[PDB]
Design a protein around this ligand. Sequence first.
Ligand SMILES: [Zn+2]
Ligand SMILES: [Zn+2]
Length: 60
Amino acid sequence: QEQKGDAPTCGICHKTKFADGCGHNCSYCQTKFCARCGGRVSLRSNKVMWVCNLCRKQQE
Ligand SMILES: [Zn+2]
Ligand SMILES: [Zn+2]
């Protein structure tokens, strides 16, 4: 991680730029993806985890 004024980008379409900070990161691959290249999977009200369509699908 290096703060060089680099904006947030999707690791799939590389188009959708995350908001001020960080977008959705795969709870597995850890890859940064947009709300369209992943899904919301919270493990009980305490922590919200996002899994890419490749993990959410392959992992059923
Ligand atoms: Zn994307
Ligand atoms: Zn993943």
